């Protein structure tokens, strides 16, 4: 289980992202080992504990 909230809070490196197919297609057809997809604004990153 990955700590996605730290990934959201921590600083990131901005990269040109290249998927051959649509992002939703390569996510939906299980190209990636671990995924987290959410819609809207997810408050989970704000409750630091």
């Amino acid at each position: 289980m990955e700590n996605w909230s730290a990934l959201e809070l921590l600083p990131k490196v901005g990269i040109p992202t290249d998927f051959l197919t649509h992002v939703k297609t390569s996510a939906g057809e299980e190209m990636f080992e671990a995924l987290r997809i959410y819609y809207g604004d997810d408050p989970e990153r704000y409750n630091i504990h």
């Binding site: 998927f19 649509h22 992002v23 939703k24």
Partner: protein
């Protein structure tokens, strides 16, 4: 009123110079289907 220089590809054909455009970049990774790729029916 003012103009801004920008670069694009141009084809010269029959004394008309025409801009060539490719809207791939608008619809990439978006949820909306590109309307220039369509379905055509035949009976």
């Amino acid at each position: 009123h003012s103009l801004t220089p920008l670069s694009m590809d141009v084809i010269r054909l029959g004394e008309k110079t025409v801009i060539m455009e490719n809207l791939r970049r608008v619809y990439k990774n978006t949820d909306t289907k590109d309307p220039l790729e369509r379905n055509v029916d035949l009976t």
